[PDB]
Amino acid sequence: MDIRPRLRIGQINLGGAEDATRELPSIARDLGLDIVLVQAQYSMVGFLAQCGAHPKAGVYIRNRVLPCAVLHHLSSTHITVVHIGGWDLYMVSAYFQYSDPIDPYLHRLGNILDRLRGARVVICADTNAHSPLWHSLPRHYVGRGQEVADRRAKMEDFIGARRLVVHNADGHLPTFSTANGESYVDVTLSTRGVRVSEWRVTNESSSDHRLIVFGVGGGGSMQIFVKTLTGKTITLEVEPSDTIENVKAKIQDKEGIPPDQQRLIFAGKQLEDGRTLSDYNIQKESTLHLVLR
């Protein structure tokens, strides 16, 4: 059913362009993206979750059978909120339009985070704000006028107040490249405890913004590798307290191998179904052997 342990996510401001919006299916297919959080889409396409008459944020779900609930009570033209079922993960696409004050967007986003208190939330925002937190250069955030300073301050204050984590990594391409120059205004945030992996800025999109890509898990504290003797590795998000049986059902879901014909082995000992992973001393990045029987 699937070869990957984690969801792969894209984030992109499309610049209102039909061509950029319409190349997204082919980019998601190419890169194995499950979900793209979009801003400034060409809204007259058929494949975005989006709200309102002239939406400026939305969500593209590449594989439509992925359970995805659009939370209508928390969503609007500029902020789309989805639940990626059926545990505690929510994703937010947000467009803070350059021409508007930022404050009403932050008030909206705070309300959302109040309803989703305790939940795993990822926020993909085109902030049109400049901060060293997301690797903006000094010439972008200092000496650019009071409105730039004020937007920066508000965004940084909000991040601190909500104890959000910025995932943008140092050393990557600017997120926004025009004829005036290159800037860093696209931000990937989460609530505390969300594991965001492999964050990078890419050149796949025809937009002036660059496509951000990253991975997110389903809440698993640890990953383990399950290895067959033909060299295939099934990577698995898992909890120390998950039992051997509720790992075999995991392998069945990924690989359609029936549990009663699965034999797992660690530290040269066959693993009994009834026990937990901790019982066997299986920690992060441990490797199990799967044998068919």
Side-chain angles (χ1 to χ4, degrees), residues 1-191 193-194 196-293:
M1 158 229 82
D2 148 282
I3 39 142
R4 295 111 50 90
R6 300 173 313 256
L7 289 163
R8 292 206 206 148
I9 314 297
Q11 158 176 7
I12 180 65
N13 175 319
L14 297 160
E18 187 175 358
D19 55 3
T21 307
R22 284 206 186 277
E23 62 179 35
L24 273 187
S26 71
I27 298 169
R29 184 173 168 87
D30 188 39
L31 283 57
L33 300 181
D34 297 286
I35 299 169
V36 187
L37 289 86
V38 306
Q39 314 83 38
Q41 64 259 42
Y42 186 78
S43 58
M44 284 302 321
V45 299
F47 55 78
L48 294 177
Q50 55 190 356
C51 301
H54 300 290
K56 298 222 175 186
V59 177
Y60 170 46
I61 304 289
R62 167 65 188 174
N63 184 353
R64 258 190 58 92
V65 302
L66 178 70
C68 173
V70 188
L71 304 191
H72 174 88
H73 48 299
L74 299 184
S75 302
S76 68
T77 51
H78 293 240
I79 306 174
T80 317
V81 179
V82 299
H83 184 226
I84 307 298
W87 195 236
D88 63 342
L89 187 73
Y90 295 82
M91 316 195 74
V92 180
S93 184
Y95 178 58
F96 302 166
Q97 197 168 307
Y98 176 78
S99 61
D100 302 345
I102 196 166
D103 309 64
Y105 297 95
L106 301 178
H107 285 298
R108 226 170 225 99
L109 194 57
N111 286 337
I112 294 160
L113 292 171
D114 288 340
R115 169 66 165 181
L116 301 179
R117 186 174 288 97
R120 292 162 82 248
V121 186
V122 172
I123 303 166
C124 296
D126 173 3
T127 69
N128 285 301
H130 304 273
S131 179
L133 264 189
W134 51 90
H135 313 304
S136 301
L137 300 178
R139 67 180 164 264
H140 303 329
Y141 61 80
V142 181
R144 288 287 283 180
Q146 195 47 39
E147 288 189 348
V148 164
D150 279 0
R151 278 188 94 79
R152 168 187 179 214
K154 284 164 183 330
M155 194 67 234
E156 295 169 339
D157 284 354
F158 180 83
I159 290 170
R162 298 287 184 168
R163 301 152 159 84
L164 299 174
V165 178
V166 174
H167 293 287
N168 294 227
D170 192 16
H172 285 270
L173 290 164
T175 74
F176 185 26
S177 176
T178 77
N180 267 318
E182 302 220 275
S183 67
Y184 308 75
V185 302
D186 304 294
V187 189
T188 311
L189 308 107
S190 79
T191 60
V194 174
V196 174
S197 72
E198 260 74 22
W199 190 101
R200 68 194 176 91
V201 177
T202 84
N203 274 304
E204 307 290 337
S205 173
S206 80
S207 180
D208 290 350
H209 289 250
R210 290 190 175 87
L211 169 75
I212 282 165
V213 169
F214 56 96
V216 182
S221 85
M222 58 179 204
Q223 224 163 239
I224 69 174
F225 303 121
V226 174
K227 204 208 154 184
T228 77
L229 290 169
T230 59
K232 158 171 47 145
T233 291
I234 304 147
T235 63
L236 220 60
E237 222 84 288
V238 97
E239 310 274 16
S241 74
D242 287 330
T243 72
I244 301 303
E245 292 180 20
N246 24 63
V247 158
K248 288 183 183 177
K250 270 261 75 179
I251 294 169
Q252 178 169 68
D253 211 292
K254 315 231 89 201
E255 294 292 347
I257 307 165
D260 79 324
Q261 282 137 85
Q262 291 188 38
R263 188 159 101 241
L264 292 160
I265 312 190
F266 176 79
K269 285 211 318 255
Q270 173 160 164
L271 305 180
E272 217 164 305
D273 281 353
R275 291 229 189 285
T276 76
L277 278 177
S278 60
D279 283 322
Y280 285 103
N281 213 314
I282 305 171
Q283 313 148 1
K284 319 217 223 71
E285 293 216 29
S286 286
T287 303
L288 310 193
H289 297 271
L290 174 64
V291 156
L292 278 39
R293 163 202 78 212

